[PDB]
Amino acid sequence: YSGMETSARGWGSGRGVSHVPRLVNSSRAARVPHAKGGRRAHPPKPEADRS
Amino acid sequence: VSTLDMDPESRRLFNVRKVQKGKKPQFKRTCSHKFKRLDDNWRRPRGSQGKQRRKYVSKGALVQVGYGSPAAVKGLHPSGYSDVLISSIAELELVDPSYEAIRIAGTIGAQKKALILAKAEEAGIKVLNSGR
Amino acid sequence: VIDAKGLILGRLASSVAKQLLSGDEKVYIINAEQAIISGSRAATLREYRETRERGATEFGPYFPKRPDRILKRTIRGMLPYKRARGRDAMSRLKVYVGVPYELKGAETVTIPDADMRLLSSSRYVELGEVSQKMGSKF
RNA sequence: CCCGAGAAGGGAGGUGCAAAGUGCCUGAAACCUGAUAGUGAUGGAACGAUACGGCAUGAAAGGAUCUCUGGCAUGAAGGAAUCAUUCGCGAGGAUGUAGUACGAAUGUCACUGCCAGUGUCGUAUCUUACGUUUUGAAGAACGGGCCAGGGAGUGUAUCUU
RNA sequence: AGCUUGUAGUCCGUAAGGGAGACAACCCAGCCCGUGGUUAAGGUCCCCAAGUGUCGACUAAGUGUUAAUACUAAAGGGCGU
RNA sequence: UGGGGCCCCGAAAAUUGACGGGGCUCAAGUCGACCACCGAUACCACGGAGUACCGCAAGGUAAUCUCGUAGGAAGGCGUUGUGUUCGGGUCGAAGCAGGGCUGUGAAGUCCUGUGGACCGUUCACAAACGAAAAUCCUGGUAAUAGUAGCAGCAAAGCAGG
RNA sequence: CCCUAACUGGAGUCCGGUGAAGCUUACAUUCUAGUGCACAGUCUAGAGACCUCUAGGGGGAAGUGAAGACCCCGUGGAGC
Numbered sequence: 048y049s050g051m052e053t054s055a056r057g058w059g060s061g062r063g064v065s066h067v068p069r070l071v072n073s074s075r076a077a078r079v080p081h082a083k084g085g086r087r088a089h090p091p092k093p094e095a096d097r098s
Numbered sequence: 099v100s101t102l103d104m105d106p107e108s109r110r111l112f113n114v115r116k117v118q119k120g121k122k123p124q125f126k127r128t129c130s131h132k133f134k135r136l137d138d139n140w141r142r143p144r145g146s147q148g149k150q151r152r153k154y155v156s157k158g159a160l161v162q163v164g165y166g167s168p169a170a171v172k173g174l175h176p177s178g179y180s181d182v183l184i185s186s187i188a189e190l191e192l193v194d195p196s197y198e199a200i201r202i203a204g205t206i207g208a209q210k211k212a213l214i215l216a217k218a219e220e221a222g223i224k225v226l227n228s229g230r
Numbered sequence: 231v232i233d234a235k236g237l238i239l240g241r242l243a244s245s246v247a248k249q250l251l252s253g254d255e256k257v258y259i260i261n262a263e264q265a266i267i268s269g270s271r272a273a274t275l276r277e278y279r280e281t282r283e284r285g286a287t288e289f290g291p292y293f294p295k296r297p298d299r300i301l302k303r304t305i306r307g308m309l310p311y312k313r314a315r316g317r318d319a320m321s322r323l324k325v326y327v328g329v330p331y332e333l334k335g336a337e338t339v340t341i342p343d344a345d346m347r348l349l350s351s352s353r354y355v356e357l358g359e360v361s362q363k364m365g366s367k368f
Numbered sequence: 369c370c371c372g373a374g375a376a377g378g379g380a381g382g383u384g385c386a387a388a389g390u391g392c393c394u395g396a397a398a399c400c401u402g403a404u405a406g407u408g409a410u411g412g413a414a415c416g417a418u419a420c421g422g423c424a425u426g427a428a429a430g431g432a433u434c435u436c437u438g439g440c441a442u443g444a445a446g447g448a449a450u451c452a453u454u455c456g457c458g459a460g461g462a463u464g465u466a467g468u469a470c471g472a473a474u475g476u477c478a479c480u481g482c483c484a485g486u487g488u489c490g491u492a493u494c495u496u497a498c499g500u501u502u503u504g505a506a507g508a509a510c511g512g513g514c515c516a517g518g519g520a521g522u523g524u525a526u527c528u529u
Numbered sequence: 530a531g532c533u534u535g536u537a538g539u540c541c542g543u544a545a546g547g548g549a550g551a552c553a554a555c556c557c558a559g560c561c562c563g564u565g566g567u568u569a570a571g572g573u574c575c576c577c578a579a580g581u582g583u584c585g586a587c588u589a590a591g592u593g594u595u596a597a598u599a600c601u602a603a604a605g606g607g608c609g610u
Numbered sequence: 611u612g613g614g615g616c617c618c619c620g621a622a623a624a625u626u627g628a629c630g631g632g633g634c635u636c637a638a639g640u641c642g643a644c645c646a647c648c649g650a651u652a653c654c655a656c657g658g659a660g661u662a663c664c665g666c667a668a669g670g671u672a673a674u675c676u677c678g679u680a681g682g683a684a685g686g687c688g689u690u691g692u693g694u695u696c697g698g699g700u701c702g703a704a705g706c707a708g709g710g711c712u713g714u715g716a717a718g719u720c721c722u723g724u725g726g727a728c729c730g731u732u733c734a735c736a737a738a739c740g741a742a743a744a745u746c747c748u749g750g751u752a753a754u755a756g757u758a759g760c761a762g763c764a765a766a767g768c769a770g771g
Numbered sequence: 772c773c774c775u776a777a778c779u780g781g782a783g784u785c786c787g788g789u790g791a792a793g794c795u796u797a798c799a800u801u802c803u804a805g806u807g808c809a810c811a812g813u814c815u816a817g818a819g820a821c822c823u824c825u826a827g828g829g830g831g832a833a834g835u836g837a838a839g840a841c842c843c844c845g846u847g848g849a850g851c
C-alpha cells in the first residue's frame with residue numbers, strides 16, 4: 048500500500064482547488080500517482096514472472 | 099598539413115551544402131520564445147488549431163527531410179574533412195589523413211592529449227581541437 | 231512648388247502623394263483655397279459637413295477646416311503616413327492658402343491631368359468655399 | 369588589528385589544493401539588485417519567421433581560392449533594348465535585328481581581410497498565442513502568475529493472431 | 530430564418546501558399562528544400578507591384594466605385610436622359 | 611403608342627464611420643470590346659533531400675511520387691540499469707552557465723568558465739524510461755505594493771527630570 | 772422630500788514606522804465601424820495617441836469570487 052495508506056478524500060467543487068484526494072485535516076494531496084508521496088502508477092510487481 | 103582529397107563533384111556538393119544550410123531554419127519548438135519553461139529543441143506541433151502544425155509560413159518551417167544536406171558531403175566538418183572523435187591513442191591508427199580530421203574527446207586529460215597530438219602530428223592527421 | 235489653382239483635389243493629391251513617395255524632393259502647394267472639387271455644390275457641402283461634424287471629442291476624427299490643412303489631409307489619406315516612409319513624405323509637404331511670402335515670385339508648376347478644364351460640366355466648388363462654409367477664416 | 373553600543377556585523381589579515389566559513393559539496397531557474405550592449409519620452413500590440421541594413425561583439429571551439437571586389441570561359445528555363453519595314457481607328461501588334469546581348473549556375477584567374485555566428489534596433493512582407501472542447505477557437509468557451517522537480521498502457525490468467 | 534430535414538458533386542473538418550479589407554469551407558492552387566524565369570486568380574489614380582491605357586457610348590444621382598455571397602431594398606411612378 | 615439602357619422619386623434609427631480608406635465626374639462609375647503590364651510555393655529550368663518499385667550490385671524509373679485530423683504501418687533519438695567488448699578521469703569525471711560545429715530532427719559532439727570524483731563505449735537485453743498543460747501535486751518565488759490594515763465598540767496624553 | 776447648507780469627531784488626503792491578500796498565457800496609449808462561434812484593446816480599414824506620476828468616482832475589461840443551485844441529460848444518487 049505504498050502511497051495508499053491514507054484516508055484522503057476529495058474536497059469537490061466550490062473551493063477553487065483540483066479534485067484530487069486530500070488529507071482529512073489538511074489540503075495536502077495524497078494517494079494519487081501525481082501527488083507527492085502518492086502511489087506509483089504501474090510499478091514493478093513481485094508477482095511478475097520474469098522466467 | 100595534407101591537402102584535402104575532395105574530387106570536383108564532392109567540392110560542388112560541399113558548396114551546395116554550404117549554400118543550402120546557410121538558409122536552413124533553426125527549427126525551434128513553436129512558442130519557445132514565449133515561455134521560459136520550454137526548451138529550444140524541436141517538438142512536432144500537435145494541436146489541431148496550432149498555426150505551425152497547420153503550416154502557416156509566418157510561423158516558421160516544419161522539420162522535414164527536404165532540408166537534408168547532399169548525401170556525399172553529409173556530416174563533414176566545415177573545413178571539408180570528416181569528423182572522427184578520438185577517445186584514446188589506439189584509435190589514431192584507423193584514420194587516414196587524406197580526408198579525415200580527428201576530434202580529440204573532451205574528457206581526455208592533458209597528459210594523454212599531448213601524446214595523442216604528437217602521434218597525430220607524426221601521422222600528419224589534422225586535429226580539430228588542440229591548444230594553440 | 232505646385233500651383234493648386236484650378237486643379238482637381240483628388241488628382242492633385244494622388245500626383246503629389248506618388249511624387250513624395252518617390253522620395254527625392256520637397257513639395258510646396260500654394261493657392262490651396264483655389265483647388266477644385268467636382269460634383270454638385272449641395273452634395274459636396276453635405277459630405278464635407280458630415281465629415282467635419284463626425285467624430286468624438288475625446289477620441290474622434292478631427293477633420294480640419296483650413297483649405298491648406300484639408301488639402302494636406304487629403305494627401306495624408308493617400309500615403310502610408312503611419313509608417314516611416316509615409317511620415318517622411320508628410321514631413322516634406324507644405325500646403326498654403328495663397329502664396330507664402332517666402333515662396334513669392336518662385337517658379338511654380340501645374341499638373342496637366344489634374345486640370346479642372348478637363349471636366350465636362352460646371353458642377354464643382356473650390357476648396358475655399360467648402361472651408362469658409364465650414365467656418366474657417368483664411 | 370581597525371570601525372561599530374556590540375559576545376551583531378563589516379574591513380583588513382590569516383588557515384586550507386580549494387572557503388568548502390558551520391542548515392557549510394556541487395549550487396540551475398523563477399524572483400530580486402547592479403553592470404554592460406542595443407534602443408528609447410511622435411508611439412501600435414502573439415513578443416516571431418523571412419530578406420536587407422545600423423550599432424555592438426565575433427579568444428576557443430567555425431571558413432583561408434574562406435570573405436570582399438572584379439575579369440574571362442561555358443551556360444538551362446527564359447530573353448531584351450534600340451533601330452528598319454509593315455499592319456492597326458487607337459493603346460499597340462507582327463517580321464528582322466535575335467534565340468542575339470544577357471541569364472540560375474558551373475569552372476577558372478586576379479584582388480581583398482574579412483566572413484560565418486551572436487545580441488539589439490530599424491525598414492519591408494506574413495502571421496489575432498498554446499493545449500482543449502468544438503461543425504466552427506484570437507474568442508466575450510474551458511486551462512495555466514512564474515520556475516524547479518514529481519506526474520498517466522502496468523502485472524497475472526486466458527483466447528486469438 | 531446564418532431555420533429544419535433530404536439528395537448529387539465538391540470542399541472545410543484535416544488544406545498550406547496566392548487573391549478577394551478582413552473571410553473554416555468564395556476564386557487560383559493542393560504544398561519536399563534552394564535559386565532563376567513565366568504565368569493563374571485577381572489587379573494596374575494613391576495607399577499598393579503594374580495603365581491617370583485605347584476605342585465607342587451612357588450616368589449627374591458621389592448613383593456607383595459590392596463575382597458567389599447569411600455581407601446587396603420592393604410594388605408603383607418619372608414631358609430625367 | 612410599344613419595346614429597351616442608365617439614373618431619379620418611392621427611401622425613416624438609434625456612439626462618429628465606412629466604396630477597405632483617400633478620393634474620383636468625356637471617371638478612378640456603368641455598358642460593349644480591346645491592348646500592354648503586374649502578380650503564387652501553380653507551370654518551366656537547374657541543383658539538392660526523401661520516398662515507392664525494380665535491380666546480385668553498380669544503379670534505373672517516377673507527367674502519372676512528396677498537404678494532412680482520428681488512425682494504422684516503418685525506422686531512429688534520449689534516460690537509468692544488466693550481460694559483454696573497448697575505453698576516459700585529480701595533467702581534472704559528473705553536473706552547471708554560455709558558446710562553436712554536425713544532424714531534416716529527436717540529439718550528439720567540441721570550446722570557455724565553474725566544479726572536485728567519477729564517467730563512458732561495441733553488440734545485445736531490460737524498465738518505476740522522455741511533460742507545457744490535468745481549477746494537476748510538492749517546494750520556491752513575483753506582480754499586486756511600500757499598497758490594504760495598524761480609525762468606528764473606552765478620540766489621551768503633556769511638561770520637567 | 773422640495774434642495775440642500777454649515778458645523779463636530781473618526782477615516783480618507785499628506786508625512787514617519789510597520790506591513791499582507793485576492794484576479795495574472797502573453798502583449799497592451801486607445802476610439803469607430805466591420806469581420807469573426809452572429810457581444811474585439813490585439814483581426815480588417817480608418818481615426819487618434821509624447822512619456823511618467825498623483826488624486827478621484829467606478830463606464831469597459833461580456834472585471835474578480837463559486838466545475839450554474841434555473842433547464843435538460845445520466846439505463847448517477849438520496850430522502851419521502
Ligand SMILES: [Mg+2]
Nearest residue numbers: 517518519741
Ligand atoms: Mg520531470
Ligand SMILES: [Mg+2]
Nearest residue numbers: 539540554555
Ligand atoms: Mg467549393
Ligand SMILES: [Mg+2]
Nearest residue numbers: 146502542679
Ligand atoms: Mg473534430
Ligand SMILES: [Mg+2]
Nearest residue numbers: 540541543544
Ligand atoms: Mg480536404
Ligand SMILES: [Mg+2]
Nearest residue numbers: 544545546547
Ligand atoms: Mg488560404
Ligand SMILES: [Mg+2]
Nearest residue numbers: 678679680681
Ligand atoms: Mg495522425
Ligand SMILES: [Mg+2]
Nearest residue numbers: 135517741742
Ligand atoms: Mg512542469
Ligand SMILES: [Mg+2]
Nearest residue numbers: 844845846847
Ligand atoms: Mg441512456
